[PDB]
Design an enzyme around this catalytic site. Structure first.
Site, PDB file in Angstrom:
ATOM      1  N   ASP A  17       4.784  -5.200   3.672  1.00 33.41           N
ATOM      2  CA  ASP A  17       6.237  -5.138   3.795  1.00 33.41           C
ATOM      3  C   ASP A  17       6.791  -6.397   4.476  1.00 33.41           C
ATOM      4  O   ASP A  17       7.801  -6.933   4.023  1.00 33.41           O
ATOM      5  CB  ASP A  17       6.720  -3.847   4.497  1.00 33.41           C
ATOM      6  CG  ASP A  17       6.098  -3.639   5.891  1.00 33.41           C
ATOM      7  OD1 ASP A  17       5.409  -4.543   6.407  1.00 33.41           O
ATOM      8  OD2 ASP A  17       6.316  -2.558   6.493  1.00 33.41           O
ATOM      9  N   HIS A  62       0.842  -1.188   0.000  1.00 33.36           N
ATOM     10  CA  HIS A  62       0.000   0.000   0.000  1.00 33.36           C
ATOM     11  C   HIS A  62       0.885   1.248   0.000  1.00 33.36           C
ATOM     12  O   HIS A  62       2.079   1.173   0.306  1.00 33.36           O
ATOM     13  CB  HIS A  62      -0.856   0.001   1.268  1.00 33.36           C
ATOM     14  CG  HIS A  62      -0.043  -0.013   2.525  1.00 33.36           C
ATOM     15  ND1 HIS A  62       0.696   1.072   2.939  1.00 33.36           N
ATOM     16  CD2 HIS A  62       0.183  -0.995   3.433  1.00 33.36           C
ATOM     17  CE1 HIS A  62       1.330   0.768   4.058  1.00 33.36           C
ATOM     18  NE2 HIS A  62       1.037  -0.480   4.377  1.00 33.36           N
TER      19      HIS A  62
END
Length: 378
Positions: free
Chosen positions: A294, A18
């Site tokens: 991540d 994102h």
């Protein structure tokens, strides 16, 4: 040497993080930057209507993550962990890059969103769903032939990040290193040093993940960061990466398998659908989109042998292209990371023969049945 003009693009898989957001937790300092709700104003060009369903599906599952984030109000009034207009714009630009590659440069995808060409999956968290919206808005210029449906899974079965709560074996293998990670040599001295200089209380529980979270979020929005936080930004990033790798190192194969193996199995399965020509052309798609995290990217990149020892940045993407040579009928995979061509482990060249690529991935791939067995002690 292969002549690329006989290569025909077959399939594309994009995994992305994102865009820029407010931090999950603020730093424990009397002086904090303001996160102003004005940052949540939606750029008009990203307006695209979508619905969310479960994988079935099926009603949108409950998101424990969204609830957790709303428990934290940042100075200025924003909630923690929310995608901002900066992030929305980054995701839009990623969408426009994809349009350039897959719509304009070659007519691989239709100019307007076609539900039958695209499969979309995200974790069930608002910033990922909104990032997905912005990516699509850029890719398709807010044009659709049919409703946009984003698929998301129950948090307890989710494979788009390493799932510690659901996988007992993974939790057990990493628990000791997770306990001591910030106490490791060189990590601990750097952490003590950054905390001292920033005037953070010795008692406050702060690790490099929290420091990195704030410096990356503040930097992306150009907020007036603490001068000491800026001075140590690079070291903070390096040490957040070291902490992560100590916990889940490249040499521990089984932990990597449980962490990212099921997701790799999904990506592999998509490639394999190309081996069956006649079977279920209905089920096959041209583009697969996965909104991941991540914490997904780090092990994912390591298993492909492409990890650069940097924290995977906001709006980063990993793109997989599958080609078939028109004369030879050979299959080739090309991998890109953050727009950059990559050469994965066990691949001679950037253009990697499918068979060699699949062999490389198979080291870390985990079928659902195997994965299921390990998620339980009994």
């Amino acid at each position: 040497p292969v002549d690329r003009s006989l290569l025909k693009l077959k399939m594309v898989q994009v995994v992305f993080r994102h865009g820029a957001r407010s931090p999950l937790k603020p730093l424990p300092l009397e002086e904090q930057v303001e996160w102003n709700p004005q940052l949540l104003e939606v750029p008009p060009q990203t307006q695209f209507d979508y619905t969310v369903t479960n994988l079935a599906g099926g009603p949108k599952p409950y998101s424990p993550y969204d609830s957790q984030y709303h428990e934290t109000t940042l100075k200025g009034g924003m909630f923690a962990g929310q995608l901002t207009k900066v992030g929305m714009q980054q995701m839009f630009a990623l969408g426009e890059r994809l349009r350039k590659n897959y719509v304009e440069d070659i007519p691989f995808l239709s100019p307007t969103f076609n539900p039958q060409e695209v499969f979309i999956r995200s974790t069930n968290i608002f910033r990922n769903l909104e990032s997905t919206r912005c990516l699509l808005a850029g890719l398709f210029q807010c044009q659709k032939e049919g409703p946009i449906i984003i698929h998301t899974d129950e948090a307890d079965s989710e494979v788009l990040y390493p799932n510690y709560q659901s996988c007992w074996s993974l939790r057990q293998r990493t628990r000791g290193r997770r306990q001591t990670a910030s106490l490791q040599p060189g990590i601990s001295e750097d952490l003590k040093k950054v905390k001292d200089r920033m005037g953070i209380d010795s008692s406050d529980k702060v690790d490099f993940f929290i420091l990195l979270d704030n410096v990356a979020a503040e930097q992306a929005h150009n907020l007036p960061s603490c001068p000491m936080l800026k001075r140590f930004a690079r070291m903070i990033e390096q040490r957040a990466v070291d902490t992560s790798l100590y916990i889940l190192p490249k040499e521990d194969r089984e932990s990597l398998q449980m962490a990212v193996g099921p997701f790799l199995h999904i990506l592999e399965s998509n490639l394999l659908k190309a081996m069956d020509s006649a079977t279920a052309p209905d089920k096959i798609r041209k583009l697969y989109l996965y909104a991941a995290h991540d914490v997904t990217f780090i092990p994912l990149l390591m298993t492909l042998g492409i990890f650069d020892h940097k924290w995977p940045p906001f709006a980063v993407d990993l793109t997989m292209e599958l080609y078939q040579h028109l004369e030879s009928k050979e299959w080739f995979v090309q991998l890109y990371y953050h727009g950059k061509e990559q050469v994965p482990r066990g691949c001679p060249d950037g253009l990697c023969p499918l068979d060699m690529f699949l062999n490389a991935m198979s080291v870390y791939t985990l079928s659902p049945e195997k994965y299921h067995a390990l998620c339980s002690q009994t």
